[PDB]
Protein backbone atom coordinates (compact mmCIF):
# COMPACT_ATOMS: atom_id res chain seq x y z
CA UNK A 1 0.00 0.00 0.00
CA UNK A 2 2.67 2.51 1.05
CA UNK A 3 5.15 2.51 -1.84
CA UNK A 4 7.82 5.22 -1.62
CA UNK A 5 9.97 5.68 -4.72
CA UNK A 6 13.66 5.10 -4.02
CA UNK A 7 16.42 7.45 -5.13
CA UNK A 8 16.89 7.61 -8.92
CA UNK A 9 14.08 5.28 -9.96
CA UNK A 10 12.30 5.40 -13.33
CA UNK A 11 8.58 6.13 -13.25
CA UNK A 12 7.73 2.91 -15.10
CA UNK A 13 9.40 0.64 -12.54
CA UNK A 14 8.15 2.84 -9.68
CA UNK A 15 4.56 2.31 -10.84
CA UNK A 16 5.19 -1.38 -11.57
CA UNK A 17 6.34 -1.92 -7.98
CA UNK A 18 3.17 -0.21 -6.74
CA UNK A 19 1.01 -2.40 -8.99
CA UNK A 20 2.76 -5.58 -7.83
CA UNK A 21 2.44 -4.57 -4.17
CA UNK A 22 -1.28 -3.92 -4.65
CA UNK A 23 -1.74 -7.27 -6.41
CA UNK A 24 0.08 -9.11 -3.62
CA UNK A 25 -1.90 -7.30 -0.91
CA UNK A 26 -5.20 -8.02 -2.67
CA UNK A 27 -6.90 -4.63 -2.41
CA UNK A 28 -8.84 -4.74 -5.68
CA UNK A 29 -10.11 -8.24 -4.82
CA UNK A 30 -11.52 -7.19 -1.43
CA UNK A 31 -13.84 -4.44 -2.70
CA UNK A 32 -15.24 -6.80 -5.36
CA UNK A 33 -16.55 -9.02 -2.54
CA UNK A 34 -17.37 -6.33 0.06
CA UNK A 35 -19.42 -4.21 -2.37
CA UNK A 36 -22.54 -6.37 -1.93
CA UNK A 37 -23.85 -8.50 0.93
CA UNK A 38 -23.36 -12.28 0.82
CA UNK A 39 -25.34 -14.34 3.33
CA UNK A 40 -23.57 -17.09 5.31
CA UNK A 41 -25.69 -19.65 3.45
CA UNK A 42 -24.29 -18.75 0.03
CA UNK A 43 -20.83 -18.07 1.49
CA UNK A 44 -20.58 -21.65 2.75
CA UNK A 45 -22.05 -22.88 -0.54
CA UNK A 46 -19.37 -21.07 -2.53
CA UNK A 47 -16.62 -22.26 -0.18
CA UNK A 48 -17.71 -25.90 -0.44
CA UNK A 49 -18.10 -25.69 -4.22
CA UNK A 50 -14.65 -24.11 -4.59
CA UNK A 51 -13.06 -26.78 -2.40
CA UNK A 52 -14.79 -29.58 -4.32
CA UNK A 53 -13.72 -28.15 -7.68
CA UNK A 54 -10.16 -27.57 -6.46
CA UNK A 55 -10.05 -31.15 -5.20
CA UNK A 56 -11.55 -32.63 -8.38
CA UNK A 57 -9.40 -30.72 -10.89
CA UNK A 58 -6.22 -31.79 -9.10
CA UNK A 59 -7.38 -35.41 -8.93
CA UNK A 60 -8.30 -35.43 -12.63
CA UNK A 61 -4.99 -33.83 -13.63
CA UNK A 62 -3.02 -36.37 -11.59
CA UNK A 63 -5.05 -39.33 -12.90
CA UNK A 64 -4.89 -38.22 -16.55
CA UNK A 65 -1.08 -38.41 -16.67
CA UNK A 66 -1.01 -42.24 -16.62
CA UNK A 67 -2.92 -42.53 -19.91
CA UNK A 68 -2.79 -41.24 -23.49
CA UNK A 69 0.97 -41.51 -24.02
CA UNK A 70 0.75 -38.60 -26.47
Amino acid sequence: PVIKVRENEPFDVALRRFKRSCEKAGVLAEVRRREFYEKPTTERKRAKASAVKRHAKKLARENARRTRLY
Binding site: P1, V2, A25
Partner: protein
Protein backbone atom coordinates in the same frame (compact mmCIF):
# COMPACT_ATOMS: atom_id res chain seq x y z
CA UNK B 1 4.71 -29.59 10.73
CA UNK B 2 6.33 -26.60 12.46
CA UNK B 3 8.87 -25.90 9.72
CA UNK B 4 10.32 -22.82 11.45
CA UNK B 5 10.42 -24.64 14.82
CA UNK B 6 11.77 -28.14 14.07
CA UNK B 7 15.37 -27.16 14.86
CA UNK B 8 14.36 -24.77 17.68
CA UNK B 9 11.72 -26.46 19.86
CA UNK B 10 10.11 -23.19 21.00
CA UNK B 11 6.76 -25.00 21.36
CA UNK B 12 5.15 -21.70 22.44
CA UNK B 13 5.06 -18.47 20.43
CA UNK B 14 5.22 -15.45 22.74
CA UNK B 15 3.85 -12.05 21.73
CA UNK B 16 6.85 -10.41 23.45
CA UNK B 17 9.18 -11.58 20.67
CA UNK B 18 8.93 -9.37 17.58
CA UNK B 19 12.22 -10.13 15.82
CA UNK B 20 11.14 -13.65 14.79
CA UNK B 21 7.44 -12.71 14.76
CA UNK B 22 7.39 -9.86 12.20
CA UNK B 23 8.36 -12.37 9.50
CA UNK B 24 4.80 -13.77 9.64
CA UNK B 25 3.15 -10.44 8.71
CA UNK B 26 3.34 -8.76 5.32
CA UNK B 27 4.03 -5.08 4.67
CA UNK B 28 0.30 -4.28 4.96
CA UNK B 29 0.03 -5.76 8.46
CA UNK B 30 -1.61 -9.03 7.38
CA UNK B 31 -0.70 -12.50 8.59
CA UNK B 32 0.91 -14.71 5.94
CA UNK B 33 -1.37 -17.75 5.51
CA UNK B 34 -0.14 -21.09 6.78
CA UNK B 35 -0.62 -22.39 3.23
CA UNK B 36 2.40 -20.25 2.30
CA UNK B 37 4.36 -20.29 5.57
CA UNK B 38 4.26 -24.09 5.87
CA UNK B 39 3.39 -23.86 9.56
CA UNK B 40 1.73 -26.52 11.72
CA UNK B 41 -2.00 -26.16 12.32
CA UNK B 42 -1.55 -25.55 16.07
CA UNK B 43 1.58 -23.38 15.76
CA UNK B 44 -0.02 -21.07 13.18
CA UNK B 45 -3.21 -20.97 15.26
CA UNK B 46 -1.33 -19.83 18.38
CA UNK B 47 0.96 -17.50 16.40
CA UNK B 48 -2.14 -15.70 15.11
CA UNK B 49 -3.29 -15.17 18.69
CA UNK B 50 0.18 -13.94 19.65
CA UNK B 51 0.13 -11.47 16.75
CA UNK B 52 -3.32 -10.29 17.85
CA UNK B 53 -1.97 -9.74 21.37
CA UNK B 54 0.98 -7.79 19.96
CA UNK B 55 -1.38 -5.64 17.90
CA UNK B 56 -3.49 -4.97 21.00
CA UNK B 57 -0.33 -4.02 22.92
CA UNK B 58 0.73 -1.84 19.95
CA UNK B 59 3.73 -4.03 19.11
CA UNK B 60 2.58 -4.71 15.53
CA UNK B 61 0.46 -2.41 13.36
CA UNK B 62 -3.01 -3.43 12.21
CA UNK B 63 -2.68 -1.88 8.73
CA UNK B 64 0.11 -0.47 6.59
CA UNK B 65 -0.97 3.17 6.96
CA UNK B 66 -2.88 3.18 10.27
CA UNK B 67 -3.54 6.93 10.32
Amino acid sequence: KFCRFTAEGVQEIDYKDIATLKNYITESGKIVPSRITGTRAKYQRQLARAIKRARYLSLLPYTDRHQ
